[PDB]
Amino acid sequence: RPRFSFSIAAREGKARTGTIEMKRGVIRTPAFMPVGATVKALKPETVRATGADIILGNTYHLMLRPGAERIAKLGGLHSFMGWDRPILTDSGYQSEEGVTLSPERSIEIQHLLGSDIVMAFDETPYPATPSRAASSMERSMRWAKRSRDAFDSRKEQAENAALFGIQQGSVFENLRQQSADALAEIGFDGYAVGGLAVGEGQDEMFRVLDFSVPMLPDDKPHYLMGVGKPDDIVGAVERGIDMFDCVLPTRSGRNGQAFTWDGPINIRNARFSEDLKPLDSECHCAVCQKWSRAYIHHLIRAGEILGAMLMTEHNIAFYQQLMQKIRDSISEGRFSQFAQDFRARYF
Amino acid sequence: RPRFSFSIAAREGKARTGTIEMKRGVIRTPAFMPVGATVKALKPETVRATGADIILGNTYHLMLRPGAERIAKLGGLHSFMGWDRPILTDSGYQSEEGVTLSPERSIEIQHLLGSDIVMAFDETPYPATPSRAASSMERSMRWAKRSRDAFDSRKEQAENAALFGIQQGSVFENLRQQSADALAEIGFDGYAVGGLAVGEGQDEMFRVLDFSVPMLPDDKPHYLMGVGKPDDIVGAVERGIDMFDCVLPTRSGRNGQAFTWDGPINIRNARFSEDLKPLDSECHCAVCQKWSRAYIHHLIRAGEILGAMLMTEHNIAFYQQLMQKIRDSISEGRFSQFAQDFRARYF
Ligand SMILES: [Zn+2]
Ligand SMILES: [Zn+2]
Q1: What does R_g of chain B's alpha carbons equal in angstroms?
Q2: Which range is the signal sequence, renumbered to this chain (chains A, B)?
Q3: Active-site positions of A?
Q4: Which residue of chain B is at minimal alpha-carbon distance from A303?
Q5: Does the B1-347 domain belong in CATH 3.20.20.105?
Q6: Which residues of chain B have a CB within 8 Å of the CB of A295?
Q7: B245 is catalytic
Q8: Rounded to whole angstroms, how far apart are CA atoms A211 and A198?
Q9: Where are the domains of chain B?
């Protein structure tokens, strides 16, 4: 495989479906990346069986424990945790130099972990005034150039990994445009939309995506960081987003929240205590094949680890099934119909 | 298969190896029964993959949550938890009537759960005076007859399950003999040695097994309740024990203790932080195939659920491998050699 190739196979409006090819494997887009040096309560083989093509790791947590250098001594993150496919690492979400973490150190840590997709080191709270959002965006663009240069100066990294830049600008169209321009001038393998899902609400997030995603190079992947709920994902794909990561399915799962095509349910609710149905009626996951709502209700009420395991496997599988229906519906020119049907039933 | 058939295929001194056949499957003896309505941190398929033929469930915990009647409404324990092979249930470890639980209720609960091997309801703290141990043993034998009659009066249970009686008597040879006599006069499908592993220490436990196990019918299985460490198991098999249950491998596992052929290790110890070796050098389990001491050290230090999962899978697999080496060495007439070699290396 090449270091990085993104190809778009089908479109419908702003939505796209395709593939990213990398040395460690192929990523089907739109993609959901489960968040990890573990996807909580799941073996990597289980994560793969749900359909994930790539997972996310964190520069912040891993650098603290067990340490980036230690992981590199041990053979890198893939070998450490037993996941042999692509890994995307966030950059580590104050001075011009960095945070006491700088762009250079961030890129180095991601190298030491052996990340396949490296994120530029970026700085913007919500709400923000125009002045503050601009100051922050500009710093982020200076740090984006430092990230680019640090990555390129490390031959092994530049030859085997990819680098994504992150658009800032808060909710302001002019700053988003400046930011997109800056990032394209530097040039990256993909472009994230940063600075959303930080308290603005779906309506506002969608409004900003509406003008922001078209500013980015059309021929490169578009990653919406930290999103989100199933309906956030569907709307964001309608606006041109190709990649997602979020802790909801894992975290939610351990707290009793199961995703279903008829909306989320809280399995701890006494109404499930004698419910022999699977979590979701249509889900093809191993959990829905084998165990009832009643059993999983019991496990979660009892604080049993197997409850966390089963809830998490189901939720990540649900999310992968969602992404597959999105991909197929775009490939078949019926994604707008799918999005409408999905929302009518989910809500 | 028959309701219950125990056949001995080979012997060496007091040690025996063979099979129990039941409707839900065959049990290889000497057997280790992992303790559960879940074996903590493991899917039942994982439990089976380690080599377990039977697991234990509890009348006490299940009757409290989620309730015996609820589990029967839901189709019984096997269907509830997704384990289709035999399950042994303890009886629920004060008046002549029972505990505020009586023999009759205990047997009924085990029926409602759908237990394959039902334990008689029994009462003896350590240390105990001869007078108190005798009083307690005698009550237990009256309760053993009540258990027998309750089981036999329920046709479905008597036709499809087995009933084991439990020997008491503390550390006193004469009371153990009276107890064995009483139980044989009533007649059971198997015989447990109760009242050990309650604080007496290995030397004393072995001394009591030395005279107590020969008192029991030779042609029926002998179950040592709540034992134990790998060396306890080996010594107890040398004294005629066929069946074991213990929470050590599961509980220990979650606390960082891994069993190995060179003795237990605590994986949280900083010495393992960069150790790329598997938990045990010879172990054939999936955990030792795939992950390092270093990774598992990190997970347990970090309190990650996957740490508990992997430690537990390894430890239960270790125990099953131990039981297989015992079975094979008895079948080959070299168990005394095995026991000596095991101890020399383990210690
Ligand atoms: Zn499911
Ligand atoms: Zn192992």
Answers
A1: 20
A2: none
A3: 90, 245
A4: B40
A5: yes
A6: 37, 74, 80-82
A7: yes
A8: 18
A9: 1-347
